Amino acid sequence: VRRTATEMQREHMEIQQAQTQAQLEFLQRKFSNKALYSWLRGRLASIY
Amino acid sequence: YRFYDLTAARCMMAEKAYAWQTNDTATRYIKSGAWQSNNAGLMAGESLL
Amino acid sequence: NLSIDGQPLSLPVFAAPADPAALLSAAAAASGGSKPLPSADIPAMRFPQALDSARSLTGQLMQFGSTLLGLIERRDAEAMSELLQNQAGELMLSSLR
Amino acid sequence: GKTRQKMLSFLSRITQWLNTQNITVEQLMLLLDKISPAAPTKEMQVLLDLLRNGGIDKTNTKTLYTTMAPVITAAMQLDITESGEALLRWLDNNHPA
Amino acid sequence: FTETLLYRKRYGIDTETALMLCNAGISRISYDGQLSHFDRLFNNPPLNGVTYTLGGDDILMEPDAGDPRREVLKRAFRVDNTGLWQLLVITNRENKSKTIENKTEKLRGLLFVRLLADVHNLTVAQLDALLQISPYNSMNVYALDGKTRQKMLSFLSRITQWLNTQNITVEQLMLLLDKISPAAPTKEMQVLL
Amino acid sequence: LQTLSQGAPAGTITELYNISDFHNLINRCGEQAGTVLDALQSGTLTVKILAQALNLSEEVITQALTLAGQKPELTTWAQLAVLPPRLDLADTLHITPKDITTLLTVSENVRPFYTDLSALAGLLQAGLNEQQTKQLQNQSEPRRN
Amino acid sequence: GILTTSEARKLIIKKGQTAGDKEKLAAWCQALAQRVLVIRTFTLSNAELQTLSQGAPAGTITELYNISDFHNLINRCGEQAGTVLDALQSGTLTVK
C-alpha cells in the first residue's frame, strides 16, 4: 500500500512537471512576452 | 489599427503642406516602418510623432 | 543453476531505468511586415496648422497605444491567473486521491 | 608518442574545462563554428527595416554604436543598450575575415 | 492462431477472450471440467432461476419494451438498457431491425462487439462514436471476414494508443471530427456579428 | 440568475427545492451551461443539445422526462429541475429512468403479478457487479433451501 | 458548404440578414470554433499554426494523425523551431 501511494506521489510530481511546462509555454506564447518588451524598449530608446 | 490609418494620412498631409510651404520636395520626413506587425502596431504614435 | 530449494544461485538481471526526458516545446519569434504609408495630398491648411492637426491625432494614437498595451498585458495576466487555478484544481484532485 | 600524449592532454584539459564552465560540446561548437553564410531571416528583415528607416545612423564614430545599439540589443535581447554599444565595438575590433 | 497469440500479447487477455476476439463462437459445451462460456455468461447464476435457453423468435432490443431475456443479455454483456441497443446498432449499421434472433451467432456478434470496447478500455458509447470516424461505418460482424476484422482491431488499437499519447479523450476527438449540421446562431454570436 | 428572473417562485421550501434542483442540473451542464441557458431563454432547448451538454444520451433524458411527462417541449426551467432527482435515482440503481417507472408501479402495487415482480427482479439484478451478484446468490441460496 | 471568408464578409455586411444565410454564418463560426479546438488540443504554437495555414487538411483521423506527427517533429526542434518553420515557409529548408 505504501508503494502504491509513492507511485501516486510520483504521478503527482509528474503532473506538476507537466504544469510547470504549461506555464513556461504560456509565458513564451503570450503576447506581452520578453521579446515584445525588448523590441519596444529598443525602438523607444532609439526614438528617445 | 484603423486609427493608425488616419494618423499616417494626417502626417502625410502635414508633410505635403510642408513641401508646399517650403519648396523642398526632395526631402521627406514622415517615413514608413511606424507600424510593425511584430508589435501589433504598438508605438506607432511614437515613431510618427 | 538453482539451489536445492529452487532459489536462484545467480544474481538477478538488473536494468538501469531510463532518466525521465527533459520536456522541450517550440518557441518562435513573431514575424510581420510593416505597413506602407498612405497616398499624400496637399491639405487645406498651411503647414504650421496641418502639423498641429496631425500632432493632436498622434497624441491620441499614443493614448490608444498605451491603453492597448495595458489591456494586452492585463488580459495575459488574467489568463495566467486562471491557468494557475485550473492547475491547482487538477492538483488537489491528486492530493485528495 | 609525442603528439598522441599531447592530444590526450588537450582532450582531458578541454573536457575538464567544459565540465567546470558547465557548457557542453554542442555549445562549444556553436561558439567555435564558422559562418558559411546563407539567406537572411524574417526577423532579420525586421531588424534591417528598423535600421533602414528611422534616424540615419551618424557617420562619425562613437555615435554609430550608440545609434545602432538599442535596436541591435532589442534583436539580441541583451541586458543593457550599453552592453549593446560595447558588443558592436568588440565584434568590430576582432572578427572572422 | 497467430492472431489469437497477438491479441493475447497486446491487451493482455485470456486465451478465451483472444479467441472470442478472433471471431469464435460461444461454446455451449463445458470445457476442462469447468463452466461453459455460454453458462458462465448467461446462467451464472441463472437470472431468477430461469435458465436462459436459445428459445428463438423472441428478443427485443429497443429499450421501451419488456422481455425477460433482454435482462440476461444486459447482465452478460455488462451493458445497460441503452447500451444493449447500441451494441445492436454497432453490430450492423445497415440493418435497422429492432429485434434479434436468439441463435448463437447473434449473441457471438454482440459479445464480440462488447469485447471490442472492453479490450481497448472503451465504453460502448465510445466504441460507437469511434467507429463512425473510422472506415468501418458500414460493417457487418456476421460478414466480417478475417482481413477486415484484424484491420479494424488494428485501427482501434492504433487510435486508442494515439489518444492515450496525445492525452485527448474520445469526446474531444468526436468534437474535433463532428460535422456542423447548423442551427440558430447564439447571443454571443449576435454580439460578434 | 437571468433564467430564474422571468418568474421563478421563491419563498417557500417547496420552491427552494426546485431552485436547488435547477441549480444542480446547471452545475452538471458545467462549461456548457451557457448554451443550455441560452437555448432555454429562446425557444430552442432540445434534448440533443441538453444531452450533449450533460454528457449523457438522448435515450436517457427523453426517458427521464416521461416521468411526470413533458417530453417534447422543453420550454421552462421548471422542466429541468425535474431531471436531477430522476437522474440521481437511475444512477444509484444502475438502470435507465424508463426502468424506474417499473420499480415504482410494482413496488407500490399491493398484489403485484409474479411476472411483473420477476421482470423487476431481473432488471435490478442485471445492473449488479459480478461479486455483487455472487454475494446476492450466497444470500439467496440458503433462504430457498 | 461552409463560407469562404470573403463570403462571410459579404454575408455579414448585408441589408437585412434573412432567416436563411444566418445559420450559414453560424455554421461558419462553428467551423471556426472546431478549428480553434484542433489548435487547442494539440497546443500548436503560432508558427506551427502559420505553417499549417497554407493547406493542412484536417477533419478526418488520417489527417489529424499527420498534424500530430508534424507537431511532434516541431516540438523536437524546440528552441530552433522558428528557423525550421521559417526556412519551410520559404523554399530553403535543407537537411543541414
Tab-separated table of N, CA, C and O in Angstrom, chain F residues 3-4 9 24 29 41-44 46 48 51 56-57 72 74 85 95 99 105 116 120 124 126 128 134 136:
chain	number	residue	atom	x	y	z
F	3	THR	N	-31.962	33.298	-15.976
F	3	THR	CA	-33.012	32.345	-16.328
F	3	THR	C	-34.141	32.373	-15.312
F	3	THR	O	-35.320	32.392	-15.681
F	4	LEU	N	-33.799	32.361	-14.030
F	4	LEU	CA	-34.802	32.386	-12.978
F	4	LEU	C	-35.501	33.726	-12.864
F	4	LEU	O	-36.542	33.806	-12.211
F	9	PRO	N	-40.671	31.148	-8.799
F	9	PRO	CA	-41.241	31.411	-7.475
F	9	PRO	C	-40.292	30.962	-6.380
F	9	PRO	O	-39.768	29.849	-6.411
F	24	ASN	N	-28.633	22.476	-9.506
F	24	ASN	CA	-27.860	21.248	-9.610
F	24	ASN	C	-27.706	20.820	-11.059
F	24	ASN	O	-26.603	20.471	-11.500
F	29	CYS	N	-24.398	20.659	-16.162
F	29	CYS	CA	-24.090	21.125	-17.512
F	29	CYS	C	-22.689	21.714	-17.571
F	29	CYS	O	-21.931	21.458	-18.511
F	41	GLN	N	-33.520	30.318	-22.834
F	41	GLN	CA	-34.038	31.677	-22.915
F	41	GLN	C	-34.769	31.912	-24.224
F	41	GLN	O	-35.803	32.588	-24.246
F	42	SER	N	-34.254	31.369	-25.317
F	42	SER	CA	-35.010	31.292	-26.552
F	42	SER	C	-35.935	30.082	-26.458
F	42	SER	O	-36.142	29.517	-25.383
F	43	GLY	N	-36.505	29.662	-27.578
F	43	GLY	CA	-37.400	28.525	-27.529
F	43	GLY	C	-36.855	27.294	-28.219
F	43	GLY	O	-37.624	26.522	-28.798
F	44	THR	N	-35.538	27.082	-28.159
F	44	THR	CA	-34.927	26.006	-28.929
F	44	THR	C	-34.063	25.079	-28.082
F	44	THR	O	-33.123	24.473	-28.603
F	46	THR	N	-33.327	21.777	-27.045
F	46	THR	CA	-33.675	20.444	-27.497
F	46	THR	C	-32.887	19.397	-26.723
F	46	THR	O	-31.808	19.656	-26.179
F	48	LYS	N	-31.237	17.021	-27.778
F	48	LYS	CA	-29.926	16.746	-28.354
F	48	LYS	C	-28.853	17.612	-27.711
F	48	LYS	O	-27.821	17.104	-27.259
F	51	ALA	N	-28.465	16.760	-23.929
F	51	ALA	CA	-27.686	15.553	-23.715
F	51	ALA	C	-26.222	15.773	-24.032
F	51	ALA	O	-25.355	15.304	-23.292
F	56	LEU	N	-24.629	12.795	-21.294
F	56	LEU	CA	-25.429	11.582	-21.277
F	56	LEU	C	-26.056	11.386	-22.649
F	56	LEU	O	-25.805	12.147	-23.584
F	57	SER	N	-26.872	10.346	-22.772
F	57	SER	CA	-27.536	10.082	-24.037
F	57	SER	C	-28.919	10.711	-24.082
F	57	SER	O	-29.559	10.939	-23.055
F	72	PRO	N	-41.626	16.457	-25.253
F	72	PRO	CA	-41.088	17.113	-26.454
F	72	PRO	C	-40.821	18.609	-26.324
F	72	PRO	O	-39.942	19.129	-27.018
F	74	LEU	N	-39.332	21.278	-24.159
F	74	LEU	CA	-38.510	21.785	-23.059
F	74	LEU	C	-38.495	23.305	-23.148
F	74	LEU	O	-37.657	23.905	-23.821
F	85	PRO	N	-33.428	14.712	-9.719
F	85	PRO	CA	-33.869	13.568	-8.902
F	85	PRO	C	-33.945	12.269	-9.680
F	85	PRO	O	-33.458	11.236	-9.203
F	95	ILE	N	-29.893	1.482	-13.598
F	95	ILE	CA	-30.954	1.250	-14.564
F	95	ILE	C	-31.266	2.574	-15.246
F	95	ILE	O	-30.847	3.641	-14.799
F	99	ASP	N	-36.684	2.320	-16.723
F	99	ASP	CA	-36.746	1.175	-15.830
F	99	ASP	C	-37.121	1.568	-14.411
F	99	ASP	O	-37.366	0.692	-13.582
F	105	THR	N	-44.249	1.325	-10.216
F	105	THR	CA	-45.589	0.765	-10.290
F	105	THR	C	-45.687	-0.571	-9.588
F	105	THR	O	-46.738	-0.885	-9.017
F	116	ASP	N	-44.574	-9.615	-13.392
F	116	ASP	CA	-44.075	-8.263	-13.182
F	116	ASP	C	-42.967	-8.239	-12.144
F	116	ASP	O	-41.947	-7.565	-12.325
F	120	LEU	N	-39.064	-7.156	-12.681
F	120	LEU	CA	-38.372	-6.132	-11.919
F	120	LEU	C	-37.133	-6.681	-11.241
F	120	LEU	O	-36.112	-5.988	-11.169
F	124	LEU	N	-33.330	-5.224	-11.755
F	124	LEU	CA	-32.428	-4.733	-10.723
F	124	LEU	C	-31.164	-5.569	-10.627
F	124	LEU	O	-30.121	-5.056	-10.215
F	126	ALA	N	-29.626	-7.298	-13.201
F	126	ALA	CA	-28.737	-7.182	-14.345
F	126	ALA	C	-27.687	-6.109	-14.123
F	126	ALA	O	-26.548	-6.262	-14.565
F	128	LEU	N	-26.043	-5.350	-11.538
F	128	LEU	CA	-25.191	-5.560	-10.385
F	128	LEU	C	-23.770	-5.902	-10.813
F	128	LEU	O	-23.514	-6.391	-11.915
F	134	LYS	N	-22.681	-12.441	-7.004
F	134	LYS	CA	-22.254	-13.615	-6.252
F	134	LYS	C	-22.674	-13.523	-4.792
F	134	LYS	O	-23.122	-14.514	-4.209
F	136	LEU	N	-25.220	-11.791	-3.639
F	136	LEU	CA	-26.666	-11.958	-3.650
F	136	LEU	C	-27.043	-13.427	-3.715
F	136	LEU	O	-27.965	-13.867	-3.025
